[PDB]
Design a protein around this ligand. Structure first.
Ligand SMILES: O=c1[nH]c(=O)c2nn[nH]c2[nH]1
Ligand SMILES: O=c1[nH]c(=O)c2nn[nH]c2[nH]1
Ligand SMILES: O=c1[nH]c(=O)c2nn[nH]c2[nH]1
Ligand SMILES: O=c1[nH]c(=O)c2nn[nH]c2[nH]1
Ligand SMILES: O=c1[nH]c(=O)c2nn[nH]c2[nH]1
Ligand SMILES: O=c1[nH]c(=O)c2nn[nH]c2[nH]1
Ligand SMILES: O=c1[nH]c(=O)c2nn[nH]c2[nH]1
Ligand SMILES: O=c1[nH]c(=O)c2nn[nH]c2[nH]1
Ligand code: NA
Ligand code: NA
Ligand code: NA
Ligand code: NA
Lengths: 295, 295, 295, 295
């Protein structure tokens, strides 16, 4: 037997960084959770108890905290590129650094209508994430994503004309609730290294905001033929509004709201056009996935 | 042996209600999770397999869905009063109905700056809750609450002058991070019945909003002497801005952000006034509780 | 306004203790999560920023770790009595200590059929808990519990003869699945202080084991007339097999497994006596509660 | 733009199956959660609102319930092969079926030492899983796994001799706690189709049990040089005890138990060889991964 593949590192490193402006007196906070896994010439650590090759996970932990000290933590695409680059450059035998970041929202608190200088709220559990892969020779791969964007529309969704057979029981419909948790991942064209990432920084924060805008706009206005149809439209536009994206990937669960028929009770009319009260379903859920690139 | 106390019912009933305005074309959605437990003359169901006394939990489930059909679901204080009242009036042997509601945020989506008529986002995991207890003879007790309000301030919190002894190691401080998840519960003066609840309805939605405003304002501006000091101030004001509240209760966990000392590394200065990067702590957490009434 | 009630302390203190036998070479591990909240003359900490009265939560954290060092951590009833007593005796102004412990299972690993001396598995997420309340003057109140005992029986449960009305749709049944997560809490007669707890120690571990045995035996063999009927029987016996219990409390959710009718598909027969495949329901759930004492 | 990749289906389908032996009177229960995603010629459903190509997720839900009715649900490798095969054979335009199953433990209850015929306990949250990929032309790929196996050893783990530099602070050690949640995935050599799966069935249940045995045995007895070293040894043996495995993959988080130094308190000695009481750490965690094949 032999080691086909190996990576190791530190997961779930919670990190908080405060930037204190002395002019304005205005503080800004950033909170991340960071994962770093390294690959390279480390298989002897697995086969020959050879720890000489192991950069301790604790040191990787340390290094995250240092790198966040010595460098900006935002935008995460950059921070992850920095942190990843660090480990391949620092260590001869480490040939890949895989950095995952989840950004937790700390939104400035409005007080009577005045951005408070040092108070924030977690205004949503919506996450911004990156997956940065820094590989010796092959530059830097970046996947940016938003996840946990939970939305619903009460009408202006349909689903009709789907295969019917001895396994079908679902009734065609022209009016229904559509609700989903949006997972939207855009993959950047490979960068040569840290310099090229540094040059594209403004596009990171800017493209994230666009993915969100588009997801929400499209979800809202599209008289959805299906989840399939509506997710494709979102992906179309993110590609079209930013050239450096090679691929957009949506994963959308269909959180079903069933009709409750209460006609058995004093002929009470709650289905079809008289549908008011629905039983939101926890499980099961449709899951719909799409990857979209350039033709 | 004997039954000292007994309640039963249906938990985790997810409920969704849509209100379709035909003038404006504008839809509004409400989503709840509801629990109902009944008490009364039911001990034989426990001791003598006497199911004659059991209003099936399934029927209670049905009844929730019906009551939401036939009545407004908002504000929850009212819906819970209605749903509770129903069961004590309907059934001779049921002498108490305990209704718990959690309201899940569906905020109208802004699109280019125009309230969309039928699209919503779950803009926070912050919950509005009620606990309605409807007891034959003793009218209606209501506890309204907000929970899951996660906040943080980077400065303008202190904690000094606390007991020191052979068990103390914590260093006094004049500048620190304070972060908490706010649990704020206000208890209404007993109502006589459903009529009196119905007459106080405008105060429900209005008092909730005030509890939130006050929690956020006070948390922000107060140069906190302690969590104790700051939570008391919040409770003070909620009492003072609404007469029908008998008691305000805060429960606040202290989510600690530890300083990371990186001086061992190239003399890097990250503590005291040079604190930038902190390790948010998952556990343990201070937990601080206060109930405040009228003197 | 005024402080009606106040408690504070440290929550979620994870604690691990190893006992190294030097004769046998055999190690034993205990892992807890501990919460301590104190009451007493502390209201000035809330009203007058008077921190002099606050035993820092950090020190309480320290004290837990010390007390576990200097004392046995098992059984939890005792550890909690010790830890609680400590704080009322040590501090003049602290008049109550509330200690909550959750014990996490570390079961010795069997290897070829030989208790390994230092390897363990978390063989279930079933928790043993205590709630110890140590109050100056009023001795020590103890509530012991088991929670998270997830069980199911495929048959030998029924539910018929329950109220039917214009809110009922549930069909009587003589054969069904019953599945629940067992919450069983037994309350000890008040102890005078730490000495009396110390004298009743053997009964703690011994009564816990009995509550479990009884819960499982009774759940299994009882042709349940209802959840009500079956939980009462369990409580009956725990009371009857240990004299120092004043009250037994069960909370049992009814995790429903619905029949799936597949007759619409090639006349496939899956209901009634031909029921094989069921859809386990996540929500809603019946919730059934009973407190049982001595008549 | 164009659809690079697409799959859709039903997730989180909870499924329960009872087998009633009429001879013995002995019932046996199986509970799964199932996910099915299909690929094939479905891109028009995304681009042209062409629902004709969509096998409704609801029908896929139905099909799972039927397939479990008409076929054995155990072992999951087989059930998943059956369920996957079904969809590629049934539908001309569906070219791949991806089936994920999680098996939830229902262990027969021992009562006085007699396997009860119809009562079971969820004796662990340890999961058995499969990932079955059924692709038109390319037969059936199966990944079997165990996850959520939470273990700990108090001693007989070490970690010394690892790279040290200006980022290192971790102290070498010869005695420490090692604790992890085991994720062990074994990948089967490709099968031609359902017949070949059917012929290898006895090996499925049998290889799972071996992966568990080996994981536990090796974890226990190995004086671990590192997590790396110990996971490799486990993988080695699973490969060596079953020929049809092509690759074994372990993912092991290192759940750290920190030493608490209590010397500041009455010179209390709790570090090094006097370590008794430790603070289990929730985060961060080392994460260690290895894939092992045949050289
Ligand atoms: O948008 C949808 N896509 C689907 O594939 C589907 N299946 N059931 N409902 C559905 N809705
Ligand atoms: O309201 C429902 N809609 C559905 O699509 C469905 N499928 N099974 N039961 C159902 N109920
Ligand atoms: O606000 C606080 N109150 C307390 O009681 C405490 N203890 N440690 N830190 C603290 N902060
Ligand atoms: O930064 C810290 N602050 C604290 O209050 C504390 N208590 N133990 N370790 C600690 N670290
Ligand atoms: O045991 C039960 N008790 C109940 O009260 C009930 N209601 N529906 N099913 C039930 N089962
Ligand atoms: O199988 C079912 N059993 C029930 O008790 C029930 N109640 N609503 N739908 C149901 N389905
Ligand atoms: O087994 C280990 N492997 C590692 O790579 C490591 N790093 N810190 N501790 C560790 N333990
Ligand atoms: O006890 C500890 N062990 C460690 O490996 C470590 N790393 N930071 N703090 C620590 N404490
Ligand atoms: Na390198
Ligand atoms: Na009544
Ligand atoms: Na005292
Ligand atoms: Na096909």
């Amino acid at each position: 037997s032999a080691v086909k593949a190996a990576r190791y590192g530190k997961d779930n490193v919670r990190v908080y960084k405060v930037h204190k402006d002395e002019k304005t007196g205005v503080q800004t906070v950033y909170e991340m959770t960071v994962c770093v896994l390294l690959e390279g010439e480390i298989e002897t650590s697995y086969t020959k108890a050879d720890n000489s090759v192991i950069v301790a996970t604790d040191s990787i932990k340390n290094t995250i905290y240092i790198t966040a000290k010595q460098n900006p933590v935002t935008p995460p695409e950059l921070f992850g590129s920095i942190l990843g680059t660090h480990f391949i450059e620092k260590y001869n035998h480490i040939h890949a650094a895989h950095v995952n970041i989840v950004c937790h929202r700390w939104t400035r608190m409005d007080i009577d209508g005045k951005p408070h200088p040092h108070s924030f709220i977690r205004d949503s559990e919506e996450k911004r994430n990156v997956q940065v892969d820094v590989v010796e020779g092959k530059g830097i791969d970046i996947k940016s994503s938003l996840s946990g964007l939970t939305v619903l529309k009460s009408t202006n969704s349909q689903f009709w004309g789907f295969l019917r057979d001895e396994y079908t029981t679902l009734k065609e419909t022209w009016d229904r609730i559509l609700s989903t948790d949006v997972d939207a991942t855009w993959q950047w064209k490979n960068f040569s290294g840290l310099q090229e990432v540094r040059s594209h920084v403004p596009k990171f924060d800017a493209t994230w905001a666009t993915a969100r805008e588009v997801t929400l706009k499209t979800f809202a206005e599209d008289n959805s033929a299906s989840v399939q149809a509506t997710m494709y439209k979102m992906a179309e536009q993110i590609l079209a509004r930013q050239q450096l994206i090679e691929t957009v990937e949506y994963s959308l669960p269909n959180k079903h709201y069933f009709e409750i028929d209460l006609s058995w009770h004093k002929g009470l009319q709650n289905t079809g056009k008289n549908a008011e009260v629905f039983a939101p379903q926890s499980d099961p859920n449709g899951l719909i996935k799409c990857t979209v690139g350039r033709s």
